[PDB]
Design a protein around this motif. Structure first.
Motif, PDB file in Angstrom:
ATOM      1  N   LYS A   1       0.829  -1.204   0.000  1.00 46.56           N
ATOM      2  CA  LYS A   1       0.000   0.000   0.000  1.00 46.56           C
ATOM      3  C   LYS A   1       0.867   1.259   0.000  1.00 46.56           C
ATOM      4  CE  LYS A   1      -3.679  -2.537   0.389  1.00 46.56           C
ATOM      5  NZ  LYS A   1      -3.894  -2.965   1.801  1.00 46.56           N
TER       6      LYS A   1
ATOM      7  N   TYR B   1     -13.515  15.113  -2.823  1.00 44.27           N
ATOM      8  CA  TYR B   1     -13.904  13.713  -2.683  1.00 44.27           C
ATOM      9  C   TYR B   1     -14.228  13.364  -1.228  1.00 44.27           C
ATOM     10  CZ  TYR B   1     -12.109  13.134  -7.448  1.00 44.27           C
ATOM     11  OH  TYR B   1     -11.891  13.242  -8.800  1.00 44.27           O
ATOM     12  N   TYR B   2     -15.026  12.319  -1.037  1.00 40.15           N
ATOM     13  CA  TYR B   2     -15.338  11.849   0.304  1.00 40.15           C
ATOM     14  C   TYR B   2     -14.830  10.427   0.534  1.00 40.15           C
ATOM     15  CZ  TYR B   2     -17.851  16.189   0.765  1.00 40.15           C
ATOM     16  OH  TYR B   2     -18.168  17.528   0.820  1.00 40.15           O
ATOM     17  N   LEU B   3     -13.959  10.284   1.530  1.00 36.20           N
ATOM     18  CA  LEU B   3     -13.388   8.988   1.869  1.00 36.20           C
ATOM     19  C   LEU B   3     -14.118   8.400   3.072  1.00 36.20           C
ATOM     20  CD1 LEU B   3     -11.154   6.776   1.607  1.00 36.20           C
ATOM     21  CD2 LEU B   3      -9.748   8.195   3.104  1.00 36.20           C
ATOM     22  N   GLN B   4     -14.720   7.230   2.879  1.00 39.25           N
ATOM     23  CA  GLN B   4     -15.417   6.543   3.958  1.00 39.25           C
ATOM     24  C   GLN B   4     -14.405   5.991   4.955  1.00 39.25           C
ATOM     25  OE1 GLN B   4     -19.250   3.760   3.749  1.00 39.25           O
ATOM     26  NE2 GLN B   4     -17.396   2.492   3.693  1.00 39.25           N
ATOM     27  N   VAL B   5     -14.585   6.334   6.226  1.00 34.66           N
ATOM     28  CA  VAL B   5     -13.708   5.852   7.289  1.00 34.66           C
ATOM     29  C   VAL B   5     -14.519   5.289   8.438  1.00 34.66           C
ATOM     30  CG1 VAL B   5     -11.889   6.432   8.931  1.00 34.66           C
ATOM     31  CG2 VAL B   5     -12.039   7.660   6.740  1.00 34.66           C
ATOM     32  N   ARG B   6     -14.192   4.074   8.856  1.00 37.48           N
ATOM     33  CA  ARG B   6     -14.835   3.467  10.016  1.00 37.48           C
ATOM     34  C   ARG B   6     -14.014   3.730  11.282  1.00 37.48           C
ATOM     35  N   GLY B   7     -14.655   4.316  12.290  1.00 37.07           N
ATOM     36  CA  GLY B   7     -14.001   4.645  13.550  1.00 37.07           C
ATOM     37  C   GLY B   7     -13.506   6.083  13.582  1.00 37.07           C
TER      38      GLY B   7
ATOM     39  N   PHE C   1     -10.367   8.184  11.700  1.00 41.15           N
ATOM     40  CA  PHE C   1     -10.691   9.429  11.005  1.00 41.15           C
ATOM     41  C   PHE C   1      -9.676  10.524  11.367  1.00 41.15           C
ATOM     42  CE2 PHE C   1     -12.655  13.584  10.702  1.00 41.15           C
ATOM     43  CZ  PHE C   1     -13.357  13.552   9.504  1.00 41.15           C
TER      44      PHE C   1
ATOM     45  N   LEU D   1      -6.231   9.804   9.896  1.00 33.30           N
ATOM     46  CA  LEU D   1      -6.198  10.127   8.467  1.00 33.30           C
ATOM     47  C   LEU D   1      -6.205  11.629   8.218  1.00 33.30           C
ATOM     48  CD1 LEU D   1      -8.426   7.173   7.313  1.00 33.30           C
ATOM     49  CD2 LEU D   1      -6.086   7.638   6.462  1.00 33.30           C
TER      50      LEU D   1
ATOM     51  N   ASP E   1     -18.563   3.159  13.960  1.00 30.86           N
ATOM     52  CA  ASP E   1     -19.362   4.168  13.277  1.00 30.86           C
ATOM     53  C   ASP E   1     -18.641   4.693  12.037  1.00 30.86           C
ATOM     54  OD1 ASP E   1     -21.773   5.459  13.046  1.00 30.86           O
ATOM     55  OD2 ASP E   1     -21.157   7.238  14.187  1.00 30.86           O
ATOM     56  N   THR E   2     -19.417   5.230  11.103  1.00 33.10           N
ATOM     57  CA  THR E   2     -18.910   5.562   9.785  1.00 33.10           C
ATOM     58  C   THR E   2     -18.859   7.061   9.573  1.00 33.10           C
ATOM     59  OG1 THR E   2     -19.630   3.499   8.738  1.00 33.10           O
ATOM     60  CG2 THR E   2     -19.372   5.429   7.309  1.00 33.10           C
ATOM     61  N   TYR E   3     -17.715   7.537   9.100  1.00 38.32           N
ATOM     62  CA  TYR E   3     -17.526   8.956   8.838  1.00 38.32           C
ATOM     63  C   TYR E   3     -17.002   9.169   7.432  1.00 38.32           C
ATOM     64  CZ  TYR E   3     -17.994   9.012  13.845  1.00 38.32           C
ATOM     65  OH  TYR E   3     -18.466   8.847  15.129  1.00 38.32           O
ATOM     66  N   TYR E   4     -17.114  10.399   6.953  1.00 36.14           N
ATOM     67  CA  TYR E   4     -16.659  10.730   5.616  1.00 36.14           C
ATOM     68  C   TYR E   4     -15.658  11.874   5.643  1.00 36.14           C
ATOM     69  CZ  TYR E   4     -20.048   7.345   4.173  1.00 36.14           C
ATOM     70  OH  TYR E   4     -20.730   6.163   4.005  1.00 36.14           O
ATOM     71  N   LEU E   5     -14.414  11.558   5.294  1.00 35.83           N
ATOM     72  CA  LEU E   5     -13.349  12.555   5.306  1.00 35.83           C
ATOM     73  C   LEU E   5     -13.337  13.299   3.979  1.00 35.83           C
ATOM     74  CD1 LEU E   5     -11.002  13.823   6.850  1.00 35.83           C
ATOM     75  CD2 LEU E   5      -9.517  12.006   5.950  1.00 35.83           C
ATOM     76  N   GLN E   6     -13.461  14.616   4.048  1.00 30.98           N
ATOM     77  CA  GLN E   6     -13.425  15.443   2.852  1.00 30.98           C
ATOM     78  C   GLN E   6     -11.978  15.604   2.391  1.00 30.98           C
ATOM     79  OE1 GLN E   6     -16.036  19.065   2.135  1.00 30.98           O
ATOM     80  NE2 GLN E   6     -14.123  20.090   2.711  1.00 30.98           N
TER      81      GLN E   6
ATOM     82  N   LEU F   1      -4.853   8.420   0.498  1.00 31.64           N
ATOM     83  CA  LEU F   1      -5.469   8.262   1.811  1.00 31.64           C
ATOM     84  C   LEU F   1      -6.291   6.979   1.891  1.00 31.64           C
ATOM     85  CD1 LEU F   1      -6.207  12.000   2.410  1.00 31.64           C
ATOM     86  CD2 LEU F   1      -4.848  10.548   3.942  1.00 31.64           C
ATOM     87  N   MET F   2      -6.845   6.558   0.760  1.00 34.43           N
ATOM     88  CA  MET F   2      -7.491   5.248   0.673  1.00 34.43           C
ATOM     89  C   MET F   2      -6.491   4.138   1.015  1.00 34.43           C
ATOM     90  SD  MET F   2     -10.344   3.518  -0.176  1.00 34.43           S
ATOM     91  CE  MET F   2      -9.884   2.464   1.195  1.00 34.43           C
TER      92      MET F   2
ATOM     93  N   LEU G   1      -3.648   4.557   2.716  1.00 32.33           N
ATOM     94  CA  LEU G   1      -3.251   4.761   4.103  1.00 32.33           C
ATOM     95  C   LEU G   1      -4.313   4.222   5.072  1.00 32.33           C
ATOM     96  CD1 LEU G   1      -1.514   8.264   3.709  1.00 32.33           C
ATOM     97  CD2 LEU G   1      -0.543   5.931   3.783  1.00 32.33           C
ATOM     98  N   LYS G   2      -5.583   4.425   4.750  1.00 35.47           N
ATOM     99  CA  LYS G   2      -6.636   3.870   5.586  1.00 35.47           C
ATOM    100  C   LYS G   2      -6.515   2.344   5.654  1.00 35.47           C
ATOM    101  CE  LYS G   2     -10.886   2.968   4.425  1.00 35.47           C
ATOM    102  NZ  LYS G   2     -12.018   3.348   3.539  1.00 35.47           N
ATOM    103  N   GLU G   3      -6.291   1.719   4.504  1.00 30.18           N
ATOM    104  CA  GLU G   3      -6.189   0.262   4.453  1.00 30.18           C
ATOM    105  C   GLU G   3      -5.016  -0.227   5.286  1.00 30.18           C
ATOM    106  OE1 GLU G   3      -8.294  -0.152   0.041  1.00 30.18           O
ATOM    107  OE2 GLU G   3      -6.120  -0.365   0.276  1.00 30.18           O
TER     108      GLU G   3
ATOM    109  N   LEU H   1      -3.711   1.365   7.898  1.00 34.07           N
ATOM    110  CA  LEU H   1      -4.095   1.521   9.301  1.00 34.07           C
ATOM    111  C   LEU H   1      -4.884   0.315   9.768  1.00 34.07           C
ATOM    112  CD1 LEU H   1      -5.440   5.077  10.187  1.00 34.07           C
ATOM    113  CD2 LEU H   1      -3.174   4.098  10.627  1.00 34.07           C
ATOM    114  N   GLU H   2      -5.890  -0.054   8.980  1.00 34.05           N
ATOM    115  CA  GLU H   2      -6.751  -1.181   9.313  1.00 34.05           C
ATOM    116  C   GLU H   2      -5.960  -2.480   9.394  1.00 34.05           C
ATOM    117  OE1 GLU H   2     -11.023   0.459   7.573  1.00 34.05           O
ATOM    118  OE2 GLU H   2      -9.563  -0.484   6.220  1.00 34.05           O
ATOM    119  N   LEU H   3      -4.921  -2.606   8.570  1.00 30.82           N
ATOM    120  CA  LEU H   3      -4.079  -3.799   8.616  1.00 30.82           C
ATOM    121  C   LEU H   3      -3.286  -3.883   9.914  1.00 30.82           C
ATOM    122  CD1 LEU H   3      -2.909  -3.863   4.923  1.00 30.82           C
ATOM    123  CD2 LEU H   3      -4.237  -5.644   6.099  1.00 30.82           C
TER     124      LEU H   3
ATOM    125  N   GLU I   1      -4.130  -2.612  12.740  1.00 30.41           N
ATOM    126  CA  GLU I   1      -5.041  -2.670  13.872  1.00 30.41           C
ATOM    127  C   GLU I   1      -5.670  -4.058  14.034  1.00 30.41           C
ATOM    128  OE1 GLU I   1      -7.503   0.710  12.921  1.00 30.41           O
ATOM    129  OE2 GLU I   1      -6.014   2.148  13.653  1.00 30.41           O
TER     130      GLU I   1
END
Lengths: 26, 27, 29, 30, 28, 28
Positions: free
Chosen positions: D20, E3-9, E13, E16, F1-6, F16-17, F19-21, F23-25, F27
């Motif tokens: 990644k 753009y909007y990036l979906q983030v859980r937690g 967030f 990021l 819970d779900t949030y949307y980062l602008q 950032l997509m 980077l999010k992945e 992070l999740e890895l 965790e």
């Protein structure tokens, strides 16, 4: 042990440092 | 200009050194 | 427990400051 | 292939993170 | 373009958002 | 819970997509 192919000496060195960093963090 | 970044902990000091080195390779 | 990283240039100084904070947040999860 | 390298990575977690991060690096460099 | 990036937690967030700060600075 | 980062820019969105992945890895 895994092997990540990297084209370019620049990204190779950076990815090395990022790997070492992940290890430190763990 | 030379700056000094304060860092708490040996672990993060070492990481930030590597991140600084990585930035310089990109620039 | 406190260390100091000399950084050349204000631009990298500011980048590294934010990267440090990212690291700290990640480590606190 | 003279400028192609293989990063040795211990463990599957870090290997998947580094892929990644590699892609991220390449995106920043375009 | 925005753009909007979906983030859980919410913790992830905030992480990021900090990483986004870094990215924008590196790109200047 | 779900949030949307602008995120401004397609570049940072895709990074950032990743980077999010990552992070999740870490965790998991």
């Amino acid at each position: 042990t895994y092997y990540l192919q990297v084209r370019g000496r620049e990204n190779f060195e950076i990815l090395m440092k990022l790997k070492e960093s992940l290890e430190l963090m763990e």
